[PDB]
Amino acid sequence: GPAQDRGVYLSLLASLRTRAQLPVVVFTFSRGRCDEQASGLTSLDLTTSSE
RNA sequence: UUUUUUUUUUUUUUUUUUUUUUUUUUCUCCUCUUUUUUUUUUUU
């Protein structure tokens, strides 16, 4: 769902950032919805202030 | 619920020269009447 797919995004990006496999590649199969995935999350901040 | 790939505006430049206005035709051709020829001279 529109508000439940975000739940999937914040589920997979939760049980994987704790461990060492934080670099992740998502193979979206559409040029259109690829930007839609990133647009509707808006909060990951997975960067240190030095980098 | 619609991915991936399909080049672009020709290359070249560091060659010598010792002439001179023009330019080229037109043929022979009946002259009518007072004359010898007047004349110095002086006033500029």
From Swiss-Prot:
It comes from the Eukaryota. Coiled coil: none annotated. It is found in: Nucleus; Cytoplasm. Component of the SKI complex which consists of SKIC2, SKIC3 and SKIC8. Interacts with HBS1L isoform 2. Helicase component of the SKI complex, a multiprotein complex that assists the RNA-degrading exosome during the mRNA decay and quality-control pathways. The SKI complex catalyzes mRNA extraction from 80S ribosomal complexes in the 3'-5' direction and channels mRNA to the cytosolic exosome for degradation. SKI-mediated extraction of mRNA from stalled ribosomes allow binding of the Pelota-HBS1L complex and subsequent ribosome disassembly by ABCE1 for ribosome recycling. In the nucleus, the SKI complex associates with transcriptionally active genes in a manner dependent on PAF1 complex (PAF1C). It is linked to Trichohepatoenteric syndrome 2: A syndrome characterized by intrauterine growth retardation, severe diarrhea in infancy requiring total parenteral nutrition, facial dysmorphism, immunodeficiency, and hair abnormalities, mostly trichorrhexis nodosa. Hepatic involvement contributes to the poor prognosis of affected patients. Belongs to the helicase family. SKI2 subfamily. This is Superkiller complex protein 2. It comes from Homo sapiens. The gene is SKIC2.
